[PDB]
Scaffold this active site. Structure first.
Site, short mmCIF file in Angstrom:
data_model
loop_
_atom_site.label_atom_id
_atom_site.label_comp_id
_atom_site.label_asym_id
_atom_site.label_seq_id
_atom_site.Cartn_x
_atom_site.Cartn_y
_atom_site.Cartn_z
N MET A 84 -6.26 39.77 33.02
CA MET A 84 -6.37 40.30 34.46
C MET A 84 -5.02 40.33 35.21
O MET A 84 -4.38 39.51 35.25
CB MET A 84 -7.15 39.59 35.30
CG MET A 84 -8.57 39.52 34.79
SD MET A 84 -9.57 38.70 36.02
CE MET A 84 -9.45 37.13 35.37
N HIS A 141 -4.18 46.35 24.79
CA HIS A 141 -5.02 46.93 25.49
C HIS A 141 -4.95 48.49 25.32
O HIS A 141 -3.90 49.33 25.66
CB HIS A 141 -4.17 46.79 27.03
CG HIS A 141 -5.00 47.25 28.23
ND1 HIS A 141 -6.29 47.83 28.20
CD2 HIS A 141 -4.87 46.92 29.64
CE1 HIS A 141 -6.93 47.99 29.24
NE2 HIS A 141 -5.92 47.31 30.10
N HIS A 200 -9.65 51.51 29.65
CA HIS A 200 -9.37 51.59 30.93
C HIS A 200 -8.53 52.75 31.27
O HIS A 200 -8.09 52.81 32.32
CB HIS A 200 -8.94 50.35 31.68
CG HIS A 200 -9.87 49.08 31.26
ND1 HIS A 200 -9.86 47.84 31.86
CD2 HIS A 200 -10.99 48.85 30.51
CE1 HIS A 200 -10.82 46.96 31.46
NE2 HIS A 200 -11.44 47.82 30.50
N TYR A 229 -5.79 53.71 30.11
CA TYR A 229 -4.30 53.53 30.05
C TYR A 229 -3.83 54.04 28.98
O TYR A 229 -4.45 55.11 28.26
CB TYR A 229 -4.12 52.08 30.24
CG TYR A 229 -4.60 51.67 31.25
CD1 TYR A 229 -5.12 50.56 31.61
CD2 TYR A 229 -3.71 52.07 32.62
CE1 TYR A 229 -5.61 50.22 32.84
CE2 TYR A 229 -3.94 51.47 33.81
CZ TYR A 229 -5.01 50.64 34.04
OH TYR A 229 -5.14 50.24 35.23
N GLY A 279 -17.27 42.48 31.14
CA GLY A 279 -17.53 43.23 32.21
C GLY A 279 -18.98 42.94 32.70
O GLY A 279 -19.96 43.16 31.84
N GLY A 337 -13.54 37.78 34.07
CA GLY A 337 -12.81 38.35 34.81
C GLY A 337 -12.98 37.58 36.29
O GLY A 337 -12.29 36.73 36.54
C1 LIG Z 1 -7.81 41.68 39.10
C2 LIG Z 1 -8.33 42.45 37.80
C3 LIG Z 1 -7.38 42.86 36.99
C4 LIG Z 1 -7.66 43.16 35.84
N1 LIG Z 1 -6.66 43.74 35.02
C5 LIG Z 1 -6.89 43.92 33.53
C6 LIG Z 1 -6.00 43.90 32.49
O1 LIG Z 1 -4.77 43.87 33.18
N2 LIG Z 1 -6.14 44.14 31.32
C7 LIG Z 1 -7.55 44.41 30.71
O2 LIG Z 1 -7.73 44.77 29.75
N3 LIG Z 1 -8.41 44.28 31.77
C8 LIG Z 1 -8.19 43.82 33.04
N4 LIG Z 1 -9.24 43.88 33.99
C9 LIG Z 1 -10.49 43.73 33.32
C10 LIG Z 1 -11.08 42.51 33.06
O3 LIG Z 1 -10.09 41.91 32.03
C11 LIG Z 1 -12.50 42.29 32.64
O4 LIG Z 1 -12.80 43.30 31.90
C12 LIG Z 1 -13.14 42.43 34.03
O5 LIG Z 1 -12.86 41.67 35.03
C13 LIG Z 1 -14.75 42.75 33.83
O6 LIG Z 1 -15.30 41.28 33.95
P1 LIG Z 1 -15.76 40.75 35.20
O7 LIG Z 1 -17.19 41.03 35.71
O8 LIG Z 1 -16.16 39.36 34.58
O9 LIG Z 1 -14.83 40.38 36.12
C14 LIG Z 1 -9.02 43.31 35.49
C15 LIG Z 1 -9.89 42.84 36.14
C16 LIG Z 1 -9.66 42.51 37.19
C17 LIG Z 1 -10.82 41.86 38.29
#
Ligand SMILES: Cc1cc2nc3c(=O)[nH]c(=O)nc-3n(C[C@H](O)[C@H](O)[C@H](O)COP(=O)(O)O)c2cc1C
Length: 365
Positions: free
Chosen positions: A25, A179, A182, A184, A299, A321
Protein backbone atom coordinates in the site's frame (compact mmCIF):
# COMPACT_ATOMS: atom_id res chain seq x y z
CA UNK A 1 -10.11 -28.36 5.80
CA UNK A 2 -9.27 -27.23 9.37
CA UNK A 3 -6.79 -24.63 8.10
CA UNK A 4 -7.45 -20.99 8.89
CA UNK A 5 -5.87 -17.58 8.77
CA UNK A 6 -3.90 -18.66 11.85
CA UNK A 7 -2.46 -21.80 10.41
CA UNK A 8 1.24 -21.65 9.72
CA UNK A 9 2.43 -21.92 6.18
CA UNK A 10 5.69 -22.61 4.38
CA UNK A 11 6.29 -20.05 1.64
CA UNK A 12 9.42 -21.72 0.38
CA UNK A 13 12.20 -20.79 2.84
CA UNK A 14 9.86 -18.46 4.78
CA UNK A 15 8.00 -20.06 7.64
CA UNK A 16 4.89 -18.02 8.15
CA UNK A 17 2.96 -18.25 11.36
CA UNK A 18 -0.23 -17.13 9.82
CA UNK A 19 -1.90 -16.27 6.50
CA UNK A 20 -2.65 -12.64 7.09
CA UNK A 21 -0.53 -10.52 4.82
CA UNK A 22 -0.01 -6.82 4.80
CA UNK A 23 -1.04 -5.86 1.31
CA UNK A 24 1.25 -3.47 -0.54
CA UNK A 25 0.00 0.00 0.00
CA UNK A 26 1.15 3.35 -1.24
CA UNK A 27 0.94 5.81 1.65
CA UNK A 28 3.28 8.55 0.41
CA UNK A 29 5.25 9.08 3.66
CA UNK A 30 8.58 8.31 1.97
CA UNK A 31 9.35 11.98 1.50
CA UNK A 32 11.44 12.69 -1.58
CA UNK A 33 11.47 9.04 -2.47
CA UNK A 34 13.48 8.02 0.57
CA UNK A 35 12.26 5.51 3.20
CA UNK A 36 12.59 6.92 6.69
CA UNK A 37 11.87 6.13 10.33
CA UNK A 38 8.22 6.75 9.78
CA UNK A 39 7.89 3.81 7.33
CA UNK A 40 10.04 1.80 9.80
CA UNK A 41 7.59 2.53 12.59
CA UNK A 42 4.62 1.84 10.33
CA UNK A 43 5.85 -1.49 9.11
CA UNK A 44 7.19 -2.50 12.54
CA UNK A 45 3.75 -1.73 14.05
CA UNK A 46 2.22 -4.08 11.57
CA UNK A 47 4.70 -6.88 11.99
CA UNK A 48 4.12 -10.13 13.71
CA UNK A 49 6.45 -13.08 14.26
CA UNK A 50 6.21 -15.12 11.12
CA UNK A 51 3.91 -12.58 9.54
CA UNK A 52 4.42 -11.64 5.94
CA UNK A 53 4.36 -8.03 4.79
CA UNK A 54 4.57 -6.48 1.40
CA UNK A 55 5.84 -2.91 1.08
CA UNK A 56 4.12 -0.08 -0.62
CA UNK A 57 4.90 0.00 -4.26
CA UNK A 58 8.45 1.12 -4.63
CA UNK A 59 10.10 2.86 -7.59
CA UNK A 60 12.33 0.76 -9.83
CA UNK A 61 13.68 3.77 -11.74
CA UNK A 62 13.32 7.48 -12.10
CA UNK A 63 10.04 8.00 -13.84
CA UNK A 64 8.43 4.89 -12.43
CA UNK A 65 6.30 6.80 -9.86
CA UNK A 66 2.88 8.27 -10.16
CA UNK A 67 2.21 9.27 -6.60
CA UNK A 68 4.02 11.72 -4.33
CA UNK A 69 6.61 10.66 -1.81
CA UNK A 70 6.76 7.02 -2.79
CA UNK A 71 9.99 5.25 -2.00
CA UNK A 72 12.46 4.00 -4.53
CA UNK A 73 14.85 1.14 -4.35
CA UNK A 74 16.92 2.01 -7.43
CA UNK A 75 19.51 4.19 -5.69
CA UNK A 76 22.15 3.54 -3.05
CA UNK A 77 20.68 6.22 -0.88
CA UNK A 78 17.29 4.38 -0.95
CA UNK A 79 18.78 1.00 -0.32
CA UNK A 80 20.47 2.38 2.80
CA UNK A 81 17.40 4.19 4.09
CA UNK A 82 15.27 1.05 3.58
CA UNK A 83 17.48 -0.96 6.00
CA UNK A 84 15.98 0.64 9.01
CA UNK A 85 12.49 -0.38 7.87
CA UNK A 86 13.57 -3.90 7.01
CA UNK A 87 15.59 -4.28 10.26
CA UNK A 88 12.57 -3.10 12.20
CA UNK A 89 10.39 -5.76 10.59
CA UNK A 90 12.99 -8.39 11.09
CA UNK A 91 13.49 -7.37 14.74
CA UNK A 92 9.84 -8.13 15.17
CA UNK A 93 10.05 -11.45 13.34
CA UNK A 94 8.31 -10.55 10.12
CA UNK A 95 9.18 -11.04 6.51
CA UNK A 96 8.85 -8.18 4.12
CA UNK A 97 8.85 -8.10 0.40
CA UNK A 98 9.53 -4.91 -1.48
CA UNK A 99 6.94 -4.28 -4.15
CA UNK A 100 8.71 -3.18 -7.30
CA UNK A 101 6.39 -0.69 -8.88
CA UNK A 102 6.39 0.92 -12.25
CA UNK A 103 3.35 3.00 -12.96
CA UNK A 104 4.00 3.47 -16.63
CA UNK A 105 1.40 5.81 -18.05
CA UNK A 106 -0.31 6.34 -14.71
CA UNK A 107 2.11 9.19 -14.08
CA UNK A 108 2.65 12.87 -14.77
CA UNK A 109 5.42 15.08 -16.09
CA UNK A 110 5.87 16.06 -12.43
CA UNK A 111 7.16 12.53 -11.71
CA UNK A 112 9.27 12.25 -14.81
CA UNK A 113 12.95 13.06 -15.32
CA UNK A 114 13.11 16.34 -17.31
CA UNK A 115 9.31 16.58 -17.08
CA UNK A 116 9.14 14.10 -19.93
CA UNK A 117 6.25 11.88 -20.92
CA UNK A 118 5.52 8.76 -18.85
CA UNK A 119 6.32 5.61 -20.70
CA UNK A 120 3.93 2.78 -21.41
CA UNK A 121 3.04 -0.04 -23.73
CA UNK A 122 0.99 2.46 -25.69
CA UNK A 123 0.88 6.14 -26.70
CA UNK A 124 -2.74 6.33 -25.46
CA UNK A 125 -3.49 8.14 -22.16
CA UNK A 126 -5.66 6.93 -19.34
CA UNK A 127 -9.04 8.44 -20.09
CA UNK A 128 -9.71 11.84 -18.54
CA UNK A 129 -13.13 11.44 -16.93
CA UNK A 130 -12.76 8.71 -14.27
CA UNK A 131 -9.10 8.85 -13.32
CA UNK A 132 -6.63 11.38 -12.03
CA UNK A 133 -3.03 11.44 -11.00
CA UNK A 134 -2.44 12.73 -7.49
CA UNK A 135 0.28 15.35 -7.52
CA UNK A 136 2.48 16.40 -4.59
CA UNK A 137 0.52 19.56 -3.93
CA UNK A 138 -2.47 17.33 -3.33
CA UNK A 139 -4.11 18.23 -6.61
CA UNK A 140 -5.62 15.70 -8.93
CA UNK A 141 -5.16 16.31 -12.66
CA UNK A 142 -5.57 14.35 -15.84
CA UNK A 143 -3.15 11.71 -16.86
CA UNK A 144 -1.03 12.73 -19.81
CA UNK A 145 -0.36 11.11 -23.13
CA UNK A 146 2.40 8.57 -22.61
CA UNK A 147 5.20 7.56 -24.96
CA UNK A 148 4.96 3.96 -26.04
CA UNK A 149 8.18 2.18 -25.32
CA UNK A 150 10.10 0.96 -28.29
CA UNK A 151 10.80 -2.75 -28.14
CA UNK A 152 14.48 -1.79 -27.86
CA UNK A 153 13.88 0.08 -24.56
CA UNK A 154 12.10 -2.77 -22.87
CA UNK A 155 15.28 -4.62 -21.79
CA UNK A 156 16.43 -1.42 -20.00
CA UNK A 157 13.14 -1.37 -18.07
CA UNK A 158 13.54 -5.06 -17.22
CA UNK A 159 17.05 -4.27 -16.04
CA UNK A 160 15.63 -1.58 -13.71
CA UNK A 161 13.46 -4.23 -12.14
CA UNK A 162 16.57 -6.45 -11.77
CA UNK A 163 18.80 -3.75 -10.19
CA UNK A 164 15.88 -2.76 -7.97
CA UNK A 165 15.36 -6.40 -6.97
CA UNK A 166 19.09 -6.78 -6.25
CA UNK A 167 18.89 -3.51 -4.30
CA UNK A 168 15.92 -4.86 -2.31
CA UNK A 169 17.95 -7.92 -1.25
CA UNK A 170 20.82 -5.54 -0.44
CA UNK A 171 18.57 -3.55 1.85
CA UNK A 172 17.64 -6.83 3.58
CA UNK A 173 14.21 -7.44 2.08
CA UNK A 174 13.28 -11.09 2.07
CA UNK A 175 12.31 -10.61 -1.50
CA UNK A 176 10.30 -8.58 -3.88
CA UNK A 177 6.90 -8.50 -5.44
CA UNK A 178 6.39 -7.60 -9.03
CA UNK A 179 3.54 -5.11 -9.19
CA UNK A 180 1.95 -6.32 -12.39
CA UNK A 181 -1.48 -5.10 -11.42
CA UNK A 182 -3.92 -2.27 -11.30
CA UNK A 183 -3.30 -0.71 -14.73
CA UNK A 184 0.31 0.10 -14.05
CA UNK A 185 3.18 -0.51 -16.47
CA UNK A 186 3.11 -4.28 -16.60
CA UNK A 187 -0.64 -4.30 -16.69
CA UNK A 188 -0.52 -1.77 -19.55
CA UNK A 189 1.21 -4.57 -21.47
CA UNK A 190 -0.98 -7.33 -20.09
CA UNK A 191 -4.44 -5.85 -20.76
CA UNK A 192 -5.96 -5.59 -24.27
CA UNK A 193 -7.86 -2.58 -22.89
CA UNK A 194 -4.54 -0.76 -23.16
CA UNK A 195 -2.01 -2.68 -25.13
CA UNK A 196 -2.49 -1.68 -28.78
CA UNK A 197 0.95 -2.85 -29.79
CA UNK A 198 1.54 -4.64 -33.09
CA UNK A 199 5.13 -5.78 -32.26
CA UNK A 200 6.17 -8.82 -30.13
CA UNK A 201 4.72 -7.22 -26.94
CA UNK A 202 1.11 -6.93 -28.10
CA UNK A 203 -1.57 -8.76 -30.02
CA UNK A 204 -1.74 -12.26 -28.64
CA UNK A 205 -2.25 -13.07 -25.00
CA UNK A 206 1.32 -14.40 -25.04
CA UNK A 207 2.64 -11.22 -26.50
CA UNK A 208 0.78 -9.25 -23.85
CA UNK A 209 2.39 -11.44 -21.18
CA UNK A 210 5.83 -11.06 -22.68
CA UNK A 211 6.78 -7.95 -20.69
CA UNK A 212 5.73 -9.57 -17.43
CA UNK A 213 7.54 -12.74 -18.48
CA UNK A 214 10.79 -10.85 -19.07
CA UNK A 215 10.44 -8.90 -15.89
CA UNK A 216 9.83 -12.02 -13.84
CA UNK A 217 12.58 -13.97 -15.63
CA UNK A 218 14.96 -11.09 -15.11
CA UNK A 219 14.17 -10.65 -11.44
CA UNK A 220 14.04 -14.41 -10.79
CA UNK A 221 17.49 -14.82 -12.43
CA UNK A 222 18.90 -11.95 -10.40
CA UNK A 223 17.60 -13.03 -6.98
CA UNK A 224 15.91 -16.43 -7.11
CA UNK A 225 12.32 -17.46 -7.72
CA UNK A 226 11.60 -18.05 -3.99
CA UNK A 227 12.21 -14.41 -3.35
CA UNK A 228 9.82 -13.23 -6.09
CA UNK A 229 6.15 -12.77 -5.73
CA UNK A 230 4.12 -11.60 -8.65
CA UNK A 231 0.99 -9.57 -8.36
CA UNK A 232 -1.66 -9.28 -11.03
CA UNK A 233 -5.29 -8.21 -11.23
CA UNK A 234 -6.69 -9.56 -14.49
CA UNK A 235 -10.21 -8.41 -13.58
CA UNK A 236 -9.51 -4.99 -12.07
CA UNK A 237 -10.46 -2.17 -14.46
CA UNK A 238 -8.42 0.55 -12.61
CA UNK A 239 -6.89 3.21 -14.88
CA UNK A 240 -8.73 1.71 -17.85
CA UNK A 241 -6.97 -1.62 -17.30
CA UNK A 242 -9.60 -3.89 -18.85
CA UNK A 243 -9.28 -7.04 -20.82
CA UNK A 244 -11.87 -8.68 -23.10
CA UNK A 245 -11.29 -11.87 -21.18
CA UNK A 246 -9.71 -11.58 -17.69
CA UNK A 247 -9.93 -15.35 -17.17
CA UNK A 248 -7.79 -16.26 -20.10
CA UNK A 249 -5.35 -13.46 -19.38
CA UNK A 250 -5.02 -14.67 -15.83
CA UNK A 251 -4.49 -18.23 -17.01
CA UNK A 252 -1.89 -17.03 -19.43
CA UNK A 253 -0.08 -15.23 -16.60
CA UNK A 254 -0.48 -18.34 -14.39
CA UNK A 255 0.61 -20.63 -17.24
CA UNK A 256 3.63 -18.51 -17.88
CA UNK A 257 4.56 -18.61 -14.17
CA UNK A 258 4.03 -22.39 -14.08
CA UNK A 259 6.35 -22.65 -17.06
CA UNK A 260 9.00 -20.41 -15.56
CA UNK A 261 8.85 -22.57 -12.37
CA UNK A 262 9.76 -25.69 -14.42
CA UNK A 263 12.41 -23.83 -16.60
CA UNK A 264 14.25 -22.68 -13.46
CA UNK A 265 13.68 -25.36 -10.72
CA UNK A 266 12.10 -23.29 -7.95
CA UNK A 267 8.72 -21.98 -7.07
CA UNK A 268 8.04 -18.28 -6.96
CA UNK A 269 7.24 -17.02 -3.50
CA UNK A 270 3.61 -16.61 -4.54
CA UNK A 271 1.10 -15.41 -7.07
CA UNK A 272 -0.84 -12.46 -5.62
CA UNK A 273 -4.14 -11.72 -7.30
CA UNK A 274 -6.54 -8.85 -6.58
CA UNK A 275 -10.23 -9.59 -6.67
CA UNK A 276 -12.53 -6.97 -8.10
CA UNK A 277 -14.90 -6.09 -5.25
CA UNK A 278 -20.08 -14.28 -8.13
CA UNK A 279 -18.16 -15.14 -11.33
CA UNK A 280 -15.35 -13.18 -9.60
CA UNK A 281 -14.61 -15.99 -7.16
CA UNK A 282 -14.77 -18.43 -10.15
CA UNK A 283 -11.99 -16.42 -11.79
CA UNK A 284 -9.99 -16.52 -8.51
CA UNK A 285 -10.61 -20.23 -7.93
CA UNK A 286 -9.58 -20.96 -11.49
CA UNK A 287 -6.28 -19.11 -11.26
CA UNK A 288 -5.48 -20.65 -7.92
CA UNK A 289 -6.27 -24.16 -9.25
CA UNK A 290 -4.11 -23.46 -12.31
CA UNK A 291 -1.25 -21.97 -10.46
CA UNK A 292 1.22 -24.42 -9.05
CA UNK A 293 2.25 -22.59 -5.97
CA UNK A 294 1.34 -20.29 -3.18
CA UNK A 295 -1.72 -18.18 -3.90
CA UNK A 296 -2.32 -14.91 -2.21
CA UNK A 297 -5.69 -13.35 -2.68
CA UNK A 298 -6.53 -9.75 -1.97
CA UNK A 299 -9.30 -7.16 -2.24
CA UNK A 300 -12.24 -6.66 0.12
CA UNK A 301 -11.34 -9.46 2.53
CA UNK A 302 -12.35 -9.25 6.12
CA UNK A 303 -11.60 -11.96 8.66
CA UNK A 304 -14.50 -14.23 7.78
CA UNK A 305 -13.84 -14.13 4.05
CA UNK A 306 -10.15 -14.71 4.77
CA UNK A 307 -10.86 -17.70 7.01
CA UNK A 308 -13.11 -19.27 4.39
CA UNK A 309 -10.63 -18.52 1.58
CA UNK A 310 -8.00 -20.50 3.45
CA UNK A 311 -10.48 -23.17 4.76
CA UNK A 312 -11.91 -23.85 1.31
CA UNK A 313 -8.49 -23.82 -0.44
CA UNK A 314 -9.19 -20.65 -2.49
CA UNK A 315 -5.99 -19.16 -1.20
CA UNK A 316 -2.98 -19.92 0.92
CA UNK A 317 -2.60 -16.32 2.01
CA UNK A 318 -4.86 -13.35 2.16
CA UNK A 319 -3.53 -9.83 2.02
CA UNK A 320 -5.35 -7.00 3.77
CA UNK A 321 -5.03 -3.39 2.87
CA UNK A 322 -7.42 -0.90 4.35
CA UNK A 323 -7.90 -2.89 7.51
CA UNK A 324 -4.17 -3.02 7.96
CA UNK A 325 -3.87 0.69 7.41
CA UNK A 326 -6.12 1.25 10.40
CA UNK A 327 -5.11 -1.80 12.48
CA UNK A 328 -1.44 -2.24 13.13
CA UNK A 329 -2.30 -5.32 15.18
CA UNK A 330 -4.77 -6.60 12.59
CA UNK A 331 -3.63 -10.19 13.02
CA UNK A 332 -4.19 -10.14 16.81
CA UNK A 333 -7.55 -8.44 16.28
CA UNK A 334 -8.55 -11.13 13.85
CA UNK A 335 -7.29 -13.84 16.22
CA UNK A 336 -9.51 -12.80 19.12
CA UNK A 337 -12.38 -11.47 16.99
CA UNK A 338 -11.82 -8.09 18.56
CA UNK A 339 -12.75 -4.60 17.46
CA UNK A 340 -11.41 -3.04 14.23
CA UNK A 341 -10.46 0.62 14.03
CA UNK A 342 -11.96 2.31 11.04
CA UNK A 343 -9.64 3.54 8.33
CA UNK A 344 -9.54 7.22 7.46
CA UNK A 345 -9.36 7.49 3.62
CA UNK A 346 -8.36 11.17 3.92
CA UNK A 347 -4.94 10.26 5.24
CA UNK A 348 -4.22 7.23 3.04
CA UNK A 349 -1.95 9.37 0.83
CA UNK A 350 -0.98 12.35 2.99
CA UNK A 351 2.56 13.00 4.19
CA UNK A 352 2.50 13.15 7.92
CA UNK A 353 4.81 10.55 9.48
CA UNK A 354 2.34 10.02 12.28
CA UNK A 355 -1.11 11.30 11.44
CA UNK A 356 -3.17 8.62 9.71
CA UNK A 357 0.02 6.58 9.47
CA UNK A 358 1.42 5.29 12.80
CA UNK A 359 -1.28 6.71 15.12
CA UNK A 360 -4.01 4.17 14.66
CA UNK A 361 -4.08 2.55 18.10
CA UNK A 362 -3.36 -1.03 19.08
CA UNK A 363 -6.02 -2.93 21.01
CA UNK A 364 -6.34 -2.15 24.66
CA UNK A 365 -5.66 -5.28 26.77
C1 LIG B 1 -3.97 3.41 0.17
C2 LIG B 1 -3.82 2.20 -0.68
C3 LIG B 1 -2.70 2.10 -1.49
C4 LIG B 1 -2.50 0.97 -2.24
N1 LIG B 1 -1.35 0.88 -2.93
C5 LIG B 1 -1.01 -0.28 -3.54
C6 LIG B 1 0.27 -0.47 -4.00
O1 LIG B 1 1.11 0.43 -3.90
N2 LIG B 1 0.57 -1.65 -4.64
C7 LIG B 1 -0.36 -2.61 -4.84
O2 LIG B 1 -0.07 -3.68 -5.41
N3 LIG B 1 -1.59 -2.44 -4.30
C8 LIG B 1 -1.92 -1.29 -3.65
N4 LIG B 1 -3.17 -1.16 -3.07
C9 LIG B 1 -4.10 -2.29 -3.18
C10 LIG B 1 -3.87 -3.11 -1.91
O3 LIG B 1 -2.59 -3.71 -1.93
C11 LIG B 1 -4.95 -4.15 -1.66
O4 LIG B 1 -5.00 -4.94 -2.84
C12 LIG B 1 -6.28 -3.41 -1.36
O5 LIG B 1 -6.19 -2.63 -0.21
C13 LIG B 1 -7.49 -4.29 -1.33
O6 LIG B 1 -7.79 -4.97 -0.16
P1 LIG B 1 -8.61 -4.30 1.07
O7 LIG B 1 -10.04 -4.35 0.91
O8 LIG B 1 -8.09 -5.23 2.21
O9 LIG B 1 -8.16 -2.83 1.38
C14 LIG B 1 -3.42 -0.07 -2.25
C15 LIG B 1 -4.57 0.05 -1.45
C16 LIG B 1 -4.77 1.17 -0.68
C17 LIG B 1 -6.01 1.23 0.15
Amino acid sequence: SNETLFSSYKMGRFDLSHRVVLAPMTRCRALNGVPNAALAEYYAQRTTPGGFLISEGTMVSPGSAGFPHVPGIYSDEQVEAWKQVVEAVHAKGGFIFCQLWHVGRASHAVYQPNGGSPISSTNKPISENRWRVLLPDGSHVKYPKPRALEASEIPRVVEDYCLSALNAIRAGFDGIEIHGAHGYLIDQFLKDGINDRTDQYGGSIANRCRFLKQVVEGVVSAIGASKVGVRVSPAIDHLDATDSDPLSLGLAVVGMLNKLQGVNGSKLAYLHVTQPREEEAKLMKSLRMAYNGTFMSSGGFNKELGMQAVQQGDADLVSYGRLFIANPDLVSRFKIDGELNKYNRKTFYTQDPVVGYTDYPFLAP
